Amino acid sequence: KLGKLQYSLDYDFQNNQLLVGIIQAAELPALDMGGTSDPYVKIHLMQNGKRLKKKKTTIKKNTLNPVFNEQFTFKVPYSELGGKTLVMAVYDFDRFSKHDIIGEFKVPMNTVDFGHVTEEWRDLQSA
């Protein structure tokens, strides 16, 4: 009902940094009588529950299926990746009002083998 987001996870062993790719979103909700939204994505890195770092994509105006193909880096020692959780939230930009959250999801990293590039779609959940 709230759309879905395709992302990738990788680790740059040449720079010791987690690589998070925001590829695209699909099937985002509109708000009226054939409207659109202005989506962007915010990414949070957490240690247990403690927020540490954050990133934001550019804004794709007037679309329900934005294609970002944007990459973000977090300096984290490989040893310390497992304690982390990623939060990815899709927001609707507005010029004058609050930017409402369309939806979000969380990705614990303790189950992830970073010898691989992980790529998946995840359905957005209400915040």
Swiss-Prot record:
Domain C2 as annotated: residue spans: 1-122
Main location: membrane
Described function: Calcium sensor that participates in triggering neurotransmitter release at the synapse. May have a regulatory role in the membrane interactions during trafficking of synaptic vesicles at the active zone of the synapse. It binds acidic phospholipids with a specificity that requires the presence of both an acidic head group and a diacyl backbone. A Ca(2+)-dependent interaction between synaptotagmin and putative receptors for activated protein kinase C has also been reported. It can bind to at least three additional proteins in a Ca(2+)-independent manner; these are neurexins, syntaxin and AP2.
Full protein segment contained here: 141 to 265 of 421
Description of post-translational modifications: Glycosylated.
Binding-site residues for Ca(2+) 2, renumbered to this chain: L31, D32, D92, D94, D100
Domains (record comment): The first C2 domain mediates Ca(2+)-dependent phospholipid binding.
Documented effect of changing R95Q: Impaired Ca(2+)-affinity
Keyword hit for Flavoprotein: no
Subunit structure: Homotetramer. Heterodimer; heterodimerizes with SYT2 in presence of calcium. Interacts with SCAMP5. Interacts with STON2. Forms a complex with SV2B, syntaxin 1 and SNAP25. Interacts with SV2A, SV2B and SV2C. Interacts with RIMS1. Interacts with PRRT2. Interacts with DNAJC5 in a phosphorylation-dependent manner. Interacts (via N-terminus) with RAB3A. Interacts with SYT12. Interacts with calmodulin. Interacts with DNM1 (via C-terminal proline-rich domain (PRD)); this interaction facilitates vesicle fission during clathrin-mediated endocytosis (CME). (Microbial infection) Interacts with C.botulinum neurotoxin type B (BoNT/B, botB). Has lower affinity for BoNT/B than Syt2; mutating its residues to match those in Syt2 increases its affinity.
Keywords: Calcium, Cytoplasm, Cytoplasmic vesicle, Differentiation, Glycoprotein, Lipoprotein, Membrane, Metal-binding, Palmitate, Phosphoprotein, Repeat, Synapse, Transmembrane, Transmembrane helix
Protein name: Synaptotagmin-1
Modification Phosphotyrosine occurs at: Y91
Record localization: Cytoplasmic vesicle, Secretory vesicle membrane; Cytoplasmic vesicle, Secretory vesicle, Synaptic vesicle membrane; Cytoplasmic vesicle, Secretory vesicle, Chromaffin granule membrane; Cytoplasm
